[PDB]
Amino acid sequence: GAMNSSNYAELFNNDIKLFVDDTNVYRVTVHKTFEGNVATKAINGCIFTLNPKTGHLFLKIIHTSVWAGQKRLSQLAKWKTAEEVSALVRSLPKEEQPKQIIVTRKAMLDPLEVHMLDFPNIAIRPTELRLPFSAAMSIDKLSDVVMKATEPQMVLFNIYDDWLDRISSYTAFSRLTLLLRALKTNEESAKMILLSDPTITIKSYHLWPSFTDEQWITIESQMRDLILTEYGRKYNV
Amino acid sequence: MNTVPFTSAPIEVTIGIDQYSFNVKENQPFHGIKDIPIGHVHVIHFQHADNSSMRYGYWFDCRMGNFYIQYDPKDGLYKMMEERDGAKFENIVHNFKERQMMVSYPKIDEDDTWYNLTEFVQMDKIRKIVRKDENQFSYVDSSMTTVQENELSDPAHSLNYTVINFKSREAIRPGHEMEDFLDKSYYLNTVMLQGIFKNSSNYFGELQFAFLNAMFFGNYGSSLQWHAMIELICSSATVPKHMLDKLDEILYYQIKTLPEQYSDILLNERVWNICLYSSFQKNSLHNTEKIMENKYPELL
Numbered sequence: 188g189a190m191n192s193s194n195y196a197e198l199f200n201n202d203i204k205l206f207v208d209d210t211n212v213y214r215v216t217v218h219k220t221f222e223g224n225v226a227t228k229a230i231n232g233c234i235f236t237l238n239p240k241t242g243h244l245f246l247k248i249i250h251t252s253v254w255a256g257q258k259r260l261s262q263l264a265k266w267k268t269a270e271e272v273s274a275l276v277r278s279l280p281k282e283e284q285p286k287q288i289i290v291t292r293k294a295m296l297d298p299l300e301v302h303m304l305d306f307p308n309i310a311i312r313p314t315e316l317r318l319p320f321s322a323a324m325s326i327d328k329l330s331d332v333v334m335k336a337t338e339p340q341m342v343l344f345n346i347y348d349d350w351l352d353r354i355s356s357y358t359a360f361s362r363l364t365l366l367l368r369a370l371k372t373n374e375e376s377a378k379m380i381l382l383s384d385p386t387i388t389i390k391s392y393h394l395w396p397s398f399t400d401e402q403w404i405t406i407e408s409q410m411r412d413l414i415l416t417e418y419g420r421k422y423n424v
Numbered sequence: 425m426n427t428v429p430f431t432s433a434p435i436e437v438t439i440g441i442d443q444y445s446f447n448v449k450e451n452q453p454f455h456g457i458k459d460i461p462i463g464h465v466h467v468i469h470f471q472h473a474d475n476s477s478m479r480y481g482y483w484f485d486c487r488m489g490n491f492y493i494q495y496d497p498k499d500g501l502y503k504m505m506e507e508r509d510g511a512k513f514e515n516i517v518h519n520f521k522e523r524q525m526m527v528s529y530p531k532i533d534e535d536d537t538w539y540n541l542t543e544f545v546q547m548d549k550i551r552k553i554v555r556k557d558e559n560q561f562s563y564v565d566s567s568m569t570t571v572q573e574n575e576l577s578d579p580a581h582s583l584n585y586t587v588i589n590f591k592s593r594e595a596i597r598p599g600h601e602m603e604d605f606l607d608k609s610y611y612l613n614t615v616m617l618q619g620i621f622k623n624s625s626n627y628f629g630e631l632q633f634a635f636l637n638a639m640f641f642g643n644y645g646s647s648l649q650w651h652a653m654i655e656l657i658c659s660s661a662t663v664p665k666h667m668l669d670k671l672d673e674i675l676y677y678q679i680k681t682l683p684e685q686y687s688d689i690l691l692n693e694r695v696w697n698i699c700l701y702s703s704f705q706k707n708s709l710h711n712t713e714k715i716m717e718n719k720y721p722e723l724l
């Protein structure tokens with residue numbers, strides 16, 4: 188059944204599972220035409236498929252050519268997502284295939300279930316959590332590889348960098364979701380927090396800066412402040 | 425015109441014959457039903473006064489044998505049986521006829537309701553859905569589950585309707601996932617019509633039989649089957665024009681006949697709203713849409 192606050196630690200047990208987020212698959216800019224009508228222009232997108240225990244991110248880049256000559260693109264995007272997730276699963280050795288796939292949006296349930304009919308033992312689940320994975324394109328290195336792609340491409344990342352050498356996967360996921368929630372609520376502020384101190388750099392093979400344990404506590408506090416504030420600024424409190 | 429005699433009526437019971445019904449009192453000198461139209465299947469059905477639980481009954485065709493009803497005090501129900509001695513049967517019926525204890529199947533001459541509800545229903549197909557090969561007639565009751573319900577527990581007593589499942593490998597061609605799920609024409613026309621049912625008449629017959637078991641016995645799995653077979657047609661973009669026209673007539677007469685007060689349980693809101701207002705065939709069921717809107721606008 189659905190994943191929620193009550194069964195949260197299940198994410199960090201030893202049953203392989205993946206989150207799939209489709210919110211950045213079909214992306215457009217909306218603009219005026221010379222005749223003064225409105226049109227859209229697609230830009231490259233991505234499927235966000237994440238193992239929350241290990242941090243392994245399977246970033247399937249969706250190049251705009253996949254939309255050429257197609258209709259009802261927002262519907263197609265869900266089915267394209269499910270096609271690519273099913274292909275990923277089939278590409279993995281049996282012992283690496285997930286036992287559950289959790290979709291962040293309920294409209295992915297039927298597309299994914301249908302594409303995974305060959306895998307009756309893989310549970311496809313929704314979630315009641317409001318996860319901030321749409322903000323993945325606010326991570327500079329992820330946005331860069333998506334925007335530069337000239338063809339369909341899969342790129343592999345660990346979204347936890349080396350954090351698991353020092354913290355558990357529960358704590359790493361909590362840090363990830365805090366960072367992403369902040370980037371979603373106020374991207375400029377969030378990014379200012381992460382980079383204000385030029386002596387803390389991002390390793391070439393990492394996504395986030397090389398904070399010490401003590402610096403992560405300061406950073407994490409600053410992201411909470413931001414979120415509560417924006418929550419005031421937004422609601423006036 | 426054929427006859428189904430009753431040995432007696434030892435317990436108070438409401439007796440149905442097709443869309444008609446009589447309340448028989450405990451030990452009411454009553455001895456069966458005459459003037460039953462030849463050429464159609466028929467259903468004789470029962471609800472005891474002391475236990476409105478379990479409606480049950482028998483599908484039959486008088487061309488296939490001489491059938492009668494006899495109460496069994498051990499099993500506690502009215503049982504259909506075949507009389508193989510034809511002279512014994514004619515003699516019984518004639519005596520019963522002279523005693524004026526046999527009700528006359530009360531068909532109005534103008535009235536094509538039963539034909540319209542059973543147009544494609546054949547006894548031979550009923551007997552493959554309801555498996556009990558030593559009898560020529562078929563028992564159904566309120567509690568019997570379908571083969572598909574059992575999958576999700578006694579198989580001898582199951583309704584072996586054709587399994588329809590929209591999220592199944594049978595329904596979905598590898599590589600056409602989105603196409604086959606959003607437009608079920610492949611599944612309707614190739615898998616089901618050409619493959620399993622062979623023709624639309626057999627498909628409609630199973631649909632009509634499922635409705636009738638839903639209506640007369642409150643059989644929940646039958647209701648599920650009826651709606652699935654409707655939904656499979658309505659969710660196909662490509663349906664033969666003769667099938668859509670016949671479907672509209674079939675459904676019109678089903679909706680017309682349904683008891684006004686059972687609509688809440690026998691009609692699935694999602695399927696009907698999808699079929700009449702969203703599906704590919706939303707504009708192909710004019711008669712059905714008009715009667716639904718005028719009789720059950722709440723559901724919609």
Ligand SMILES: CNCC(=O)N(C)c1ccccn1
Nearest residue numbers: 446453454455524525526527
């Ligand atoms: C529901 N009446 C059953 C019936 O036809 N019979 C028993 C009868 C007919 C005429 C007068 C009395 N009984």
